[PDB]
Design a protein around this ligand. Structure first.
Ligand code: HEM
Ligand SMILES: *C(=O)Cc1ccc(C(C)(C)C)cc1
Length: 465
């Protein structure tokens, strides 16, 4: 039957000649226009099936969600992970690392209460930290990273850190830079010709280091727990893991090594801290660019929540507009443009084509968030996309920033919450302004790649009365 259509690949370099010089994302979209919604591009000696548009990403990830449930390697970070840990695990190892990781969070707040009170509590510390700066010029990057990070730490590490704790900031600064580098041009280059470049110095190297430092700290805490582990009273993801580890003294085919702990924690620590926050950050840029939206987002925080209490979770259900503004931020944000590398397990008959077992599939999520089919004016910040004539939230098929299928984000729950509770609580005690006029605001991503890092802007949170 053969693979989907796609430019013929030269030996070794593959389609290095049909790519675009702007990046993997821009390259895929250009290939889409000539070869369709489902095409095969060769990233080196690698045949990968690209999926563009809402319908093409669902017909695979949702309706044949079993064949497309495989995970692929990422050039730069594969060295660290090597198929280990919950994010890059595959097969039985994955199923059980998800089964665990997922149900571990549930034991510590993923049931959305003891976590809500944690997020709420964190916002309280944010509001106090910001109010203390008297609303001067600050880069909200390292501070937003903190609030979202402490939420996964409240679960995976038990403790939380201080916004000024030295060891804590170093951890966060690493996650910030490690994400930029991974999303940089060279990382996308390294994706194609890793087999050659991996012998020379470059960014892919400073990535290995950066993460190995967070690994050093991870193990350093894993031991700090080990020596104080009380079985009758597990404290966090670690303890429970060390326990599921103790209940398997003999089985050498348990998928719970020291490896999977050091690497699963890394995944949750990273993922949890990182994307939830850059989304909060990208968000507040829009909130400066389209201020009339900010005012209306506040008029709702007022009409529904008031000024006395904090924003609680159930409040989101009674704030249609604000739920849409968050949704749109998340849509035009698009922190993970082409998703995380998928692969097919079985030989998959799909749209007339046959995709070989273990062939990689790239779900172009960005192409679904921007599908003209499912969005009027896809190219502009528009809270209306998610509103019916009445003014109540309207589900949109094309809204998948967390992706779809048996491989959907675990942070779906905590993230969407962190977003809302953090977005409102801030806008409830602060109003934002920047020296850069709404007209001169440039949403254009400082770095566009596997991730989509927004520029770093100066902003100030002005107290309210
Ligand atoms: C705005 C916030 C977030 C966004 C947009 C996001 C997005 C994504 C995406 C696109 C994927 C992979 C999609 C795919 O497999 O096709 C993913 C997977 C994953 N996320 Fe996130 N994420 C966010 C926050 C979080 C948080 C807070 C956590 C944990 C606390 C987390 C943990 C994970 C894990 C463990 C996976 C891999 C699951 C698997 O491979 O089966 N993420 N996320
Ligand atoms: C949000 O999570 C940013 C992000 C996503 C995925 C990764 C990995 C997959 C660990 C490289 C890093 C940062």
């Amino acid at each position: 039957g053969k693979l989907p259509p796609g430019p013929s690949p030269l030996p070794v370099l593959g389609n290095l000649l049909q790519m675009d010089r702007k990046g993997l994302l821009r390259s895929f979209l250009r290939l889409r226009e000539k070869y369709g919604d489902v095409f095969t591009v060769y990233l080196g000696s690698r045949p990968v099936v690209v999926l563009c548009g809402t319908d093409a990403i669902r017909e695979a990830l949702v309706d044949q969600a079993e064949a497309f449930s495989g995970r692929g390697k990422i050039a730069v970070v594969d060295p660290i992970f090597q198929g280990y840990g919950v994010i890059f695990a595959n097969g039985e190892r994955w199923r059980a690392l998800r089964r665990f990781s997922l149900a571990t969070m549930r034991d510590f707040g993923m049931g959305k209460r003891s976590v809500e009170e944690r997020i709420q509590e964190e916002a309280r510390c944010l509001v106090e930290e910001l109010r203390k700066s008297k609303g001067a010029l600050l880069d909200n990057t390292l501070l937003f990273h903190s609030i979202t990070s402490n939420i996964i730490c409240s679960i995976v590490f038990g403790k939380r850190f201080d916004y000024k704790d030295p060891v804590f900031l170093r951890l966060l600064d690493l996650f910030f830079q490690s994400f930029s580098l991974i999303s940089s041009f060279s990382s996308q280059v390294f994706e194609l010709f890793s087999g050659f470049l991996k012998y020379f110095p470059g960014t892919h190297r400073q990535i290995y280091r950066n993460l190995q430092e967070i690994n050093t700290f991870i193990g350093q805490s894993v031991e700090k727990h080990r020596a104080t582990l009380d079985p009758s009273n597990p404290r966090d993801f670690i303890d429970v893991y060390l326990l599921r580890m103790e209940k398997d003294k003999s089985d050498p085919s348990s998928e719970f090594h020291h490896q999977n702990l050091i690497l699963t924690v890394l995944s949750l620590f990273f993922a949890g801290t990182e994307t939830t926050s850059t989304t909060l950050r990208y968000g507040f840029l829009l909130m400066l660019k389209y201020p009339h939206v900010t005012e209306r987002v506040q008029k709702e925080i007022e009409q529904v929540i008031g000024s006395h209490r904090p924003p609680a979770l159930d409040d989101r259900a009674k704030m249609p507009y604000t739920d849409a503004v968050i949704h749109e931020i998340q849509r035009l944000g698009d922190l993970i443009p082409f998703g995380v590398p998928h692969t097919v397990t079985k030989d998959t008959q799909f749209r007339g084509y046959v995709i070989p077992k273990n062939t990689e599939v790239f779900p172009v999520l960005s192409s679904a968030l921007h599908d003209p089919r499912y969005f009027e004016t896809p190219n502009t910040f528009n809270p209306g996309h998610f509103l019916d004539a009445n003014g109540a939230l309207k589900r949109n098929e094309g809204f998948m920033p967390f992706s779809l299928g048996k491989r959907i984000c675990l942070g779906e729950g905590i993230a969407r919450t962190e977003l809302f509770l953090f977005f409102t609580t801030i806008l409830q005690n602060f109003s934002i302004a920047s020296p850069v006029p709404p007209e001169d605001i440039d949403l254009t991503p400082r770095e566009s790649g596997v991730g989509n890092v927004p520029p770093s802007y100066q902003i100030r949170f002005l107290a309210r009365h």
